[PDB]
């Protein structure tokens, strides 16, 4: 996390693009001169933008820093930003028992409702001879319990030297969800 | 004075509940423990921070920090010789209390006798 607080007296860069407490642009100056300004006016230094090639810092009072920090949290409370998608992994065996496959199927369903990406890998069972067409059937068994909830983000694909398959499931988008409801309703009208 | 042991342990004849539950028998061994190796404090750390303070204000130019660099150097040499003498004196002389090895030889001659002869 990047907090909006006083940077302190030790500045990271040597050349600093400084601004005034009222927003007036003071141009670039050496950090030694900035510390002198902070002491002469009794102000604190905050970092407004870092993407710019010349580091942009601004002088502010303790009251301004509070007002900005309050403004930012209200912007998020009102317009909360979405977080990055978390990737969950599962490694199954070809000869996985049905009771255990049901346990992991219920777990995959809970990850999809939370809008996660589920990477499912299927390896050849121990002391078992299996074909890639039979291992690929487990994916459809898993995804069949989630008719209009999940779909393939990355279809089954041999990996690890052809020993194991791998796919990535995701939650259906809102447009894809309304389409499923539409197609389902059409079948209801036909039947 | 050593705290009393009368009526402290669960025994026949002792009515009260036990006061102490030693996981080892309260019988003196014929040896003491080995002194643990200690971690000393850093020396000249004060002079090190004074040196690195002038560097920050003089753009790491040694020409402007000679007196601070020299002080940190002299301290390091003095702390080096003292470290060289601390071994010859404290490790070999056994100042003050005896060392475990010597103290264990003294206990060998007067072993605790928890049995009858």
């Amino acid at each position: 996390k990047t907090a909006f607080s006083n940077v302190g007296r030790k500045i990271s860069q040597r050349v600093i693009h400084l601004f005034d407490e009222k927003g007036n642009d003071l141009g670039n100056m050496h950090r030694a001169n900035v510390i002198r300004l902070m002491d002469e006016r009794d102000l604190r230094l905050v970092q407004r933008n870092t993407s710019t090639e010349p580091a942009e810092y601004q002088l502010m009072t303790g009251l301004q820093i509070l007002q900005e920090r309050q403004r930012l949290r209200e912007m998020e409370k009102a317009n909360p930003k979405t977080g990055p998608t978390l990737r969950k992994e599962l490694i199954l065996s070809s000869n996985i028992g049905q009771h255990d496959l049901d346990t992991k199927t219920k777990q995959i369903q809970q990850w999809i409702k939370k809008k996660h990406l589920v990477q499912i890998t299927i390896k050849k069972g121990k002391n078992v001879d299996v074909s890639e067409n039979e291992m690929e059937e487990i994916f459809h068994q898993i995804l069949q319990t989630m008719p209009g909830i999940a779909t393939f983000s990355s279809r089954p694909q041999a990996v690890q030297g052809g020993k194991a398959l791998m796919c990535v499931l995701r939650a259906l988008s809102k447009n894809e969800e309304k389409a499923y409801k539409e197609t389902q309703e059409t079948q209801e009208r036909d039947t | 004075a050593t705290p009393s042991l009368r009526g402290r342990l669960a025994r026949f004849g002792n009515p009260r509940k036990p006061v102490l539950k030693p996981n080892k028998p309260l019988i003196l061994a014929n040896r003491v423990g080995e002194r643990r190796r200690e971690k000393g404090e850093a020396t000249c750390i004060t002079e090190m921070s004074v040196m690195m303070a002038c560097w920050k204000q003089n753009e790491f130019r040694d020409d402007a920090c000679r007196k601070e660099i020299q002080g940190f150097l002299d301290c390091a040499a003095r702390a080096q010789e003292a470290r060289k003498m601390r071994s010859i004196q404290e490790t070999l002389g056994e100042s003050g209390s005896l060392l475990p090895n010597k103290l264990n030889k003294l206990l060998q001659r007067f072993p605790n006798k928890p049995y009858l002869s």
Binding site: - | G40, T43, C44, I45, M48, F60, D62, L73
Partner: protein, 208 residues
């Protein structure tokens, strides 16, 4: 070693032997009468009693030697000392009477001072605390300081950045830069000081 532990290293110093007996102390008198009963190793073919012997230049020469080719390493060394001296004589004749007083023309004085300007005061040593290694700033011994100065200078001259420039011209140029507190070898010392100053918080992990 083919020398038994009884063999002592030879002392190659004419002054040490011509010193009168009256000036000797009771401790120095004991050492001299003791060496008369000890076995002495043969003097290596490197050092002699010459008045032009310089142990620092001899050490820098060995650190430049590749595959035991001492003749070539020694050749590069004397060519550098000549190149430094010719550059200073050219700078001296082209200077004014006032500036001439500050121009050094002794290549041995320049070489020693250039290395002294590149020696780092502090370094980073890994100390184990709580099962993890931390780069802790610590004071460097005199041996390590001098070694790092030589190694950095030689490494900089072998860098591929120099295109077709011969070693005596590269090294002579780097020495005169370091002699004036400039160049990439001085920068490498400043980086080690900046990286040791950044880890100032970890300085207390040291116990000596």
């Amino acid at each position: 070693s083919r020398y038994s532990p009884e063999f002592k290293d030879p002392l190659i110093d004419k002054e040490y032997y011509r010193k009168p007996v009256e000036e000797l102390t009771e401790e120095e008198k004991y050492v001299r009468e003791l060496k008369k009963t000890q076995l002495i190793k043969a003097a290596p073919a490197g050092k002699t009693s010459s008045v032009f012997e310089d142990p620092v230049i001899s050490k820098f020469t060995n650190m430049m030697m590749i595959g035991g080719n001492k003749v070539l390493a020694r050749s590069l060394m004397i060519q550098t000392l000549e190149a430094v001296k010719r550059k200073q004589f050219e700078k001296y004749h082209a200077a004014s009477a006032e500036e001439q007083a500050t121009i050094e023309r002794n290549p041995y004085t320049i070489f020693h001072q250039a290395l002294k300007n590149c020696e780092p005061m502090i370094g980073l040593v890994p100390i184990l605390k709580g099962g993890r290694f931390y780069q802790v700033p610590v004071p460097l011994p005199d041996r390590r300081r001098r070694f790092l100065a030589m190694k950095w200078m030689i490494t900089e001259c072998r860098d591929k950045k120099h295109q077709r420039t011969l070693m005596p011209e590269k090294l002579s140029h780097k020495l005169l830069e370091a002699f004036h507190n400039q160049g990439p070898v001085i920068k490498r010392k400043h980086d080690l000081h900046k990286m040791a100053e950044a880890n100032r918080a970890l300085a207390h992990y040291r116990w000596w």
